[PDB]
Design a protein around this ligand. Structure first.
Ligand SMILES: [Zn+2]
Ligand SMILES: [Zn+2]
Ligand SMILES: [Zn+2]
Ligand SMILES: [Zn+2]
Lengths: 60, 60
């Protein structure tokens, strides 16, 4: 079970909407599990100079 | 008290779209100077999970 999603623990494939948490942990998340819209997601992933952090890393 | 835009050296004021580099240095940049679009700008300021880094910090 290779890149486990941080929220749901199931594997993240390339043909799923996935984001890396560059804020710290370096875990991937299914976009769906994080609750983030396709509209936020596609834009984040189109701006290279933008980077994201998960709910847990932004909490500390 | 002056905030020079890390690209153009001119002050960043309140009536101007601006963005802080939290990857690293922590200078303010006018949105216009970065060549960042308004939609990316709205996402980045809206979403607290999304942080921005300038070309110099992202570069190295
Ligand atoms: Zn998931
Ligand atoms: Zn994280
Ligand atoms: Zn400027
Ligand atoms: Zn910077």
């Amino acid at each position: 079970p290779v890149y486990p999603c941080g929220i749901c623990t199931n594997e993240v494939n390339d043909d799923q909407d996935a984001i890396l948490c560059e804020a710290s942990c370096q875990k991937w998340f299914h976009r769906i599990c994080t609750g983030m819209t396709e509209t936020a997601y596609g834009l984040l992933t189109a701006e290279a100079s933008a980077v994201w952090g998960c709910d847990t890393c932004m909490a500390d």
